[PDB]
Write a protein that binds this ligand. Structure first.
Ligand SMILES: C#Cc1cc(C#CCOc2ccccc2)cc(CN2CCC(N(CC)CC)CC2)c1O
Ligand SMILES: [Zn+2]
Length: 196
C-alpha cells in the first residue's frame, strides 16, 4: 500500500508552518515555500510548526512518516541505509532503522507497522506555551538523500498527520525533504531552476 499525501485541514484547521531561515551557506535547515521543500543537514534540528484554528481533543496525536515521492518507488519503505542503521547513534528511543526522529520529547513513540512495515514517529498534540500561538516539533533526518542502499538520491516526502487517540485521521499536511551537506546552496539552486 501507499499512504495518502492529500492535504486535509479537517475540523480543526490543521496545517504546518516553517521558519524563515534564509539560504546562507552556514544554514542547517531551510524551507522553500515555492518548492514546498525542506532542505536540511544530517541529524540537525528541523523545527516544524503545527497550527490549528481550534483546539482538538485531549489524546490527539501528531505522526510523521516518510515516503518516496516518485510513484515507481512509493511502495518501498523509506529507511536508513545499510551504513547508518549500524552506526550506533541511538538516542535510546528511536530504532536505529528509522529515518525520522523527534528530538527532546520523552513521549515520542516509534512505530514499525505490523502490516506495511513502514516507520513513523508520533507525539501527543498539546496546547502552545503561554505567549505562543503554535506548537513546534523538532525533527531530525538521519540519512542523506544520497545515501547508497538507502534513499539513494530518490526524493522523499514527509507526511504529517493529526490523529485521534485511535489513530483515525483528523488532518494531514506534507512537504518534500532533501537531506544534504549544503541546504542553503541547494535551496537557491532548486529555486533558480524552478524559475528558469
Ligand atoms: C498547535 C496547536 C494547538 C494544540 C492544542 C491541543 C490539544 C490537545 O490536548 C489538549 C490538552 C488539554 C486540553 C485540551 C486539549 C490546542 C491549541 C490551542 N489553540 C489556542 C489558540 C486558538 N485560536 C487563537 C485564539 C486560533 C485562532 C486555537 C487553539 C493549539 O493551538
Ligand atoms: Zn545513510
Amino acid at each position: 500500500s501507499v499512504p495518502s499525501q492529500k492535504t486535509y485541514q479537517g475540523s480543526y484547521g490543521f496545517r504546518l508552518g516553517f521558519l524563515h531561515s534564509g539560504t546562507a551557506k552556514s544554514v542547517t535547515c531551510t524551507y522553500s515555500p515555492a518548492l514546498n521543500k525542506l532542505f536540511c543537514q544530517l541529524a540537525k534540528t528541523c523545527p516544524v510548526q503545527l497550527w490549528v484554528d481550534s483546539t482538538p481533543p485531549p489524546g490527539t496525536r501528531v505522526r510523521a512518516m516518510a515516503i518516496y515521492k516518485q510513484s515507481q518507488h512509493m511502495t518501498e519503505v523509506v529507511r536508513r541505509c545499510p551504513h547508518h542503521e549500524r552506526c550506533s547513534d541511538s538516542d535510546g528511543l528511536a530504532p536505529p532503522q528509522h529515518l525520522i526522529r523527534v528530538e527532546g520529547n520523552l513521549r515520542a513513540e516509534y512505530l514499525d507497522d505490523r502490516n506495511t512495515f513502514r516507520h513513523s514517529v508520533v507525539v501527543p498534540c498539546e496546547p502552545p506555551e503561554v505567549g505562543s500561538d503554535c506548537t513546534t516539533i523538532h525533527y531530525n533526518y538521519m540519512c542523506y538523500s544520497s545515501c547508497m542502499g538507502g534513499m539513494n538520491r530518490r526524493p522523499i516526502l514527509t507526511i504529517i498527520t493529526l490523529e485521534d487517540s485511535s489513530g483515525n485521521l483528523l488532518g494531514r499536511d506534507s512537504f518534500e525533504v532533501r537531506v544534504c551537506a549544503c541546504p542553503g546552496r541547494d535551496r537557491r539552486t532548486e529555486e533558480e531552476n524552478l524559475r528558469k
